[PDB]
Write a protein that binds this ligand. Structure first.
Ligand SMILES: [Mg+2]
Ligand SMILES: [Mg+2]
Ligand SMILES: [Mg+2]
Ligand SMILES: [Mg+2]
Ligand SMILES: [Mg+2]
Ligand SMILES: [Mg+2]
Ligand SMILES: [Mg+2]
Ligand SMILES: [Mg+2]
Ligand SMILES: [Mg+2]
Ligand SMILES: [Mg+2]
Ligand SMILES: [Mg+2]
Ligand SMILES: [Mg+2]
Ligand SMILES: [Mg+2]
Ligand SMILES: [Mg+2]
Ligand SMILES: [Mg+2]
Ligand SMILES: [Mg+2]
Ligand SMILES: [Mg+2]
Ligand SMILES: [Mg+2]
Ligand SMILES: [Mg+2]
Ligand SMILES: [Mg+2]
Ligand SMILES: [Zn+2]
Lengths: 98, 49, 91, 136, 251
RNA sequence: UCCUAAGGGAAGGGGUAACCCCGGCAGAUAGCGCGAUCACGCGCAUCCCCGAAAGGGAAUCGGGUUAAGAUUUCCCGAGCC
RNA sequence: CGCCCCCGGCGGCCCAUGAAAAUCCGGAGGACCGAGUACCGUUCACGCCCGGUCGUACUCAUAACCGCAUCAGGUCUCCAA
RNA sequence: GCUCUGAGGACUGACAGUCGACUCAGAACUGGUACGGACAAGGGGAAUCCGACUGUUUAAUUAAAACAAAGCAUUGCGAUGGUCCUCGCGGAUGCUGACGCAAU
RNA sequence: CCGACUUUGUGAAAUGAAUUUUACUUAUUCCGUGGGUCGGAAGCGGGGCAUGCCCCUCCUUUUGGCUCCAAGGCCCGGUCUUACCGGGCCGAUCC
């Protein structure tokens, strides 16, 4: 259900709190303020594995996007390249609801 | 004219691990990669049950 | 202002070499100079560095590929054949 | 859950001690007066213990088993933290207080005591990962 | 008469290969215990242009199996390898592009390059830019295999011979017209002194069998025997036919 | 002067009627090296020499001075390897 | 928008990717080692001594080079109001 | 030639002050209609033959339509091989291998 | 270019009264290494549907990191004689 995650994330973009980018998704993890991490498929393996590590430490879920970094940016409805995402407040959506 | 008896050591070195040979952004990634893969060695051994 | 009706990239060759040679070198003129998408960093910043070598400006990957295009259509067939042929024998 | 709490092992990631292991002593989570970035005080090992084996005599084992400790305020971005822990919270009062580190004599005294207790824990044989150096 | 241009090439005086900026031989690893009974991980460090050759060359840094040092090997680039890739060398290395395997590990139909001929001769077939060999069948009662080579020739090779999975990079290089004596000259400068080539019909009889005559013409059959002495074996050596190829003649 | 480039000569060997011709052909290889001598241990891997007054390159600047030397060769001062 | 020299960082062309080594530096590792009426180091500063062999004048050309010459010929460069 | 006009800037505190080396246009007057006044510096056009072009060549009588060229085609060759050198051992192509070498 | 003799040995079959086919490895030729793991047999796991007795594996797939000069155990010997150096095997299956 790649389209079913794309639409939910589109709704999180309009409703909830969210954060983009490696240097700030990490800050959310250290604050433990995030609730779910989304990772583009071609996120550089060092970066991806260290974010996986912090997620394991913070007991937070990690989802691996089905596209690429350009596709994750487009799904978030942003005009640039994105490879990291954190859902701070899910908002009026059903992403954490998996 | 890098010879030891022609430059001061502080002017010839950089005080970090791998300094003077590897930049900071490279050494940082080697630290992260070495740690993470060392962790995967033992998670893989624990998977070996 | 439009500067060539049809010549384009092979306009530098001037009035020489023949219509057919210009019109069949034109495609591998444009293809080796265009910027190709990098599957590692998603930018349109892969550009040829030598015959068969394609370097990316940002992420530092250099990729071995076709001489005048990044990815040969024959090579896509090869990679797909390998993919399938690994799957069935890993089964 | 928050994983940057005093007592956790942390590998310093950058600057004159990158690659050294350490333990977080106390965390300045909500910035400070003059360091608005998040940071945290950490105590680590500048010089790891050398390998001890049965063959060498007691004097050389004692020679090889000593440690050199260092205190550093690190930005969280500069520490890449880990699950492991050091159970010695008995530096809470030793290296605690926002006063035991301003002056050099005070700092070096704290490092001497931290040496003594980390050498004791190395003697105990526990936390072997904390004393095997990151081999990068 | 005098010695012909084609005979003069056997001395090397001005006909040796221009090998000053070449980066060394492009070949596999020494076949050994690890590469025979397991796999070895090598990291590709850089894909360099080798002067005088159409294909890129991939420098690969293995770790020496039994002594403490690296090994910078230098492979022929198979289309797709990028710096940082881990290429696996040995028998039980999985079948992916850039890996090198024996033919006992490559299924029928697999496309390979840099094939060995005698097990351990370090890779000789299918090396030019954009050439590959298709592994056709395996005979396990002989421990042998068959391959279709770029020429279309079909060869039986030992089954323990290594082969790089994939095809040589730089494919389609020869598709581009050079359009210039300039490009031709710069092509052959870094290969060898075999350009320009003077039509023997525009020579004098003393140096070429075709030369001479008030008009420019060969004079006799342009096809010579296989056994013609050197200095006369010039033209179409032992031709089986001539003329523009049509139909099955071009198969 | 030192180091290599294209290249050249060569020890063992192969050829040669002999002068002479081949250098990777692999030979207990030319050379062994380093820590130690209050001695010994460890290593030996593509293993010699020659080849550039335009390539690479330990270090110098100023002012004077002779009939003719020196800008930096002598003198004066100040440096550098 | 001045001339010459050098440097910086962009961009461009290549079926052309545009030398090697001596030398120098840095690092990975840590076998082995030491005092506090004192002994082990120190790539620090200062201090002392020595620096060998060969070329070195002059033309570099419508007169010092080659063309049987004090030959309208030929011979590589740097500075350039 | 000479006398002007206009436009294009910098720094400092939609303006004010200080500075500015140049370029570009326009005008009035003037001369024995002379003005790129010396120097420097394409004759143009209509066609035919040949070679596509650039390039190279008989030093000391021939610079071309000749040679080369890319383009086109053909032939041999899968290494125990093709073309070739070598008195012999051995060697060049080959630090190569058919998108290649070799002969036309 | 091909034929014969020579280096050129071994045993085996089928055709005639020598001929083609084969098999062996040490002569011979070639190839590869810094002659760095070859041959047979063990063992560690996986397939069992005659518990067979025949097969398949060798503790590295992983992200451009690092790996050397052994840790560990056992058995001797020298020694202060109440305090310490040299040995041997296993680790690293045998033949
Ligand atoms: Mg410094
Ligand atoms: Mg020529
Ligand atoms: Mg041609
Ligand atoms: Mg021709
Ligand atoms: Mg003629
Ligand atoms: Mg003739
Ligand atoms: Mg003729
Ligand atoms: Mg010399
Ligand atoms: Mg010199
Ligand atoms: Mg010089
Ligand atoms: Mg003096
Ligand atoms: Mg550039
Ligand atoms: Mg002089
Ligand atoms: Mg002089
Ligand atoms: Mg003279
Ligand atoms: Mg004379
Ligand atoms: Mg012409
Ligand atoms: Mg003439
Ligand atoms: Mg003439
Ligand atoms: Mg040959
Ligand atoms: Zn990229």
């Amino acid at each position: 259900s790649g389209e079913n995650i794309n639409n939910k994330l589109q709704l999180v973009m309009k409703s909830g709190k969210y954060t983009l980018g490696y240097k700030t998704v990490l800050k959310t993890l250290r604050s433990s303020k995030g609730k779910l991490i989304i990772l583009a498929n071609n996120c550089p393996p060092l970066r991806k594995s260290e974010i996986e590590y912090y997620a394991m430490l913070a007991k937070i879920s990690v989802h691996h996007f089905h596209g690429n970094n350009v596709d994750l940016g487009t799904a978030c409805g942003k005009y640039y390249r994105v490879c990291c995402l954190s859902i701070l407040d899910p908002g009026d959506s059903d992403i954490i609801s998996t | 004219e890098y010879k030891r008896s022609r430059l001061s050591r502080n002017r010839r070195t950089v005080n970090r691990p791998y300094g003077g040979v590897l930049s900071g952004p490279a050494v940082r990634e080697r630290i992260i990669r070495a740690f993470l893969v060392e962790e995967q060695k033992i998670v893989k051994k624990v998977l070996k049950i | 202002t439009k500067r060539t009706k049809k010549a384009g990239i092979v306009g530098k060759y001037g009035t020489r070499y023949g219509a057919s040679l210009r019109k069949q070198i034109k495609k591998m003129e444009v293809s080796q100079h265009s910027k190709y998408f990098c599957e590692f960093c998603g930018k349109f910043a892969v550009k040829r560095k030598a015959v068969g070598i394609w370097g990316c400006k940002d992420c530092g990957k250099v990729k071995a590929g076709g001489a005048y295009t990044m990815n040969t259509a024959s090579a896509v067939t090869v990679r797909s054949t390998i993919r399938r042929l690994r799957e069935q024998t890993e089964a | 859950v928050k994983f940057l709490k005093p007592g956790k092992a942390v590998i310093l990631l950058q600057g004159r001690f990158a690659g050294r292991k350490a333990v977080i002593v106390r965390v300045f989570e909500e910035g400070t007066r003059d360091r608005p970035y998040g940071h945290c005080l950490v105590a680590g090992l500048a010089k790891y213990p050398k390998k001890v084996i049965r063959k060498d005599s007691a004097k050389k084992t004692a020679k090889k088993s000593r440690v050199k400790c260092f205190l550093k305020l690190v930005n969280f971005t500069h520490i890449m933290p880990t699950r492991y822990t050091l159970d010695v919270d008995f530096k809470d009062v030793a290296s605690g207080g926002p006063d035991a580190l301003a002056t050099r004599d005070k700092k070096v005294a704290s490092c001497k005591a931290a040496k003594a207790r980390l050498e004791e824990r190395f003697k105990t044989g526990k936390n072997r990962w904390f004393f095997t150096k990151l081999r990068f | 008469g005098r010695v012909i241009r084609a005979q003069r090439k056997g001395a090397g005086s001005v006909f040796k290969s221009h090998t000053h900026h070449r980066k060394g031989p492009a070949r596999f690893r020494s076949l050994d215990f690890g590469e025979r009974n397991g796999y070895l991980k090598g990291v590709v460090t850089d894909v360099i242009h080798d002067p005088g050759r159409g294909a890129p060359l991939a420098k690969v840094t293995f770790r020496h199996p039994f002594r403490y040092k690296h090994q910078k090997e230098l492979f022929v680039a198979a289309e797709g390898m990028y710096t940082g890739q881990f290429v696996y060398c040995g028998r039980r290395a999985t079948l992916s592009v850039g890996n090198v395997l024996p033919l006992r590990s490559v299924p029928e139909g697999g496309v390979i390059c840099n094939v060995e001929h005698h097990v351990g001769d370090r890779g000789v077939f299918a090396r030019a830019s954009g050439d590959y060999a298709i592994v056709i069948s395996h005979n396990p009662d002989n421990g042998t295999s068959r391959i279709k080579l770029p020429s279309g020739a079909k060869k039986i090779v030992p089954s323990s011979c290594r082969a790089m999975i994939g095809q040589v990079a730089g494919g389609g290089r020869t598709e581009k017209p050079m359009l210039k004596a300039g490009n031709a000259y710069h092509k052959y400068r870094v290969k060898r002194n075999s350009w320009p080539k003077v039509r023997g019909v525009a020579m004098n009889p003393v140096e070429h069998p075709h030369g001479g005559g008030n008009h420019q013409h060969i004079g006799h059959a342009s096809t010579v025997r296989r056994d013609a002495p050197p200095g006369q074996k010039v033209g179409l050596i032992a031709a089986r036919r001539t003329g523009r190829l049509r139909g099955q003649a071009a198969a």
